Amino acid sequence: SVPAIFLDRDGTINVDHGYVHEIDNFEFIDGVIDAMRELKKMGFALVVVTNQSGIARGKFTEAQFETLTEWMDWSLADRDVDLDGIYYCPHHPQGSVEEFRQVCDCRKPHPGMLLSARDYLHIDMAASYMVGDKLEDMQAAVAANVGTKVLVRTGKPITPEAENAADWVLNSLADLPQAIKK
Ligand SMILES: [Zn+2]
């Protein structure tokens, strides 16, 4: 089995401009590509796990999401970062788009996406890390037995409740390799 870094996307990998779904509005956060490259070198699988309820809302389409996600995967590959998995949840129970209007067990704080990655990549969850900017990320992590729960400061303001549920709070994903080393 392998340890992993589970990664939210908006606010962790890219700047959260609100419902980001276009290549020209996708901005990698400073230092995160270098950090991802270092985390792979430290033995970790890298798995994106993202809630994308804007699809259920009709803020943008699944086609727009797929297009951006393919672009993002190639962009990282071209910079020597080969993501091991990419998981997303397009659902919302109040969704306007019928196809995605539902309750599910993949919408964080539900651990579904992390459990699916666990089984697909044979992940050692106790040895793994979840990195995000929201309470729901930390709650999905505790449910999935992720050993270390990490908040970053590059996304949504950290709430006391998110802080409570986290083990570590870092400035950004760029700080994670050094924090693990230490
Ligand atoms: Zn879902």
| Cβ-based neighbour number of residue 73 at 10 Å | 15
Q: Are 62 and 55 in contact (CB under 8 A)?
A: yes
What is the 107 CA–ligand 1 centroid distance (Å)?
Answer: 4
State the method: X-ray
CA distances from 144 to 23, 114, 139, 150 (A): 32, 7, 9, 14
CA-only gyration radius of the chain, Å: 15
User: What are residue 92's phi and psi, to 5 degrees?
Assistant: -155, 140
| Token pair recorded at residue 28 | 């990698």
Using the mean position of ligand 1's atoms as its centre, give its distance from the Cα of residue 35 in Å: 28
Query: 175: annotated binding-site residue?
Result: no
Angle at 73 between CA 145 and CA 67, to 5 degrees: 110
Q: What is the resolution of this structure in A?
A: 1.5
From CA 54, how far away is CA 70, in angstroms rounded?
A: 18
The annotation status of 149 as a binding-site residue, yes or no, is no
Active-site pick, 10, 73, 84, 175: 10
| Distance between Cα 84 and ligand 1 center (Å) | 20
* Per-domain residue ranges of the chain: 1-182
Give the Cβ contact number of residue 55 at 10 Å.
Answer: 25
- Where b means 16+ CB within 10 Å and e means fewer, 141-164 reads beebebebbbbbebbbebeeebee
- How far, in Å, from the CA of 82 to the mean position of ligand 1? 24
Tell me which residue of 149, 172, 171, 173 sits closest to 161, measured CA to CA: 149
Cβ proximity of 83 and 69 under 8 Å: no
The response to whether 105 counts as a known ligand-binding position is no
CA distance 99 to 143: 27
User: What are 50's strand-pairing partners?
Assistant: 88
How many Å lie between the centroid of ligand 1 and the Cα of residue 90? Answer: 6
DSSP code string of 134-155:
SHHHHHHHHHTT-SEEEEESSS
Is 10 annotated in the active site? yes
CATH of domain 1-182: 3.40.50.1000
The residues with which 5 forms a beta bridge, in sequence order, are: 46, 129
Output the CA–CA distances (angstroms, integers) from residue 157 to 82, 87, 99, 152, 171, in the order listed. Answer: 29, 24, 31, 9, 11
Residue 137 annotated as binding site: no
Alpha helices (runs of H) in the chain, residue ranges in sequence order: 32-41, 54-57, 62-78, 112-121, 135-143, 160-165, 176-181
Q: Using omega within 30 degrees of 0 as the cis cutoff, is the peptide bond preceding 177 cis? A: no
Is 167 annotated as a binding-site member? no
User: How many CA atoms lie less than 13 Å away from 37 in the CB half-sphere?
Assistant: 11
3-state secondary structure of 166: coil
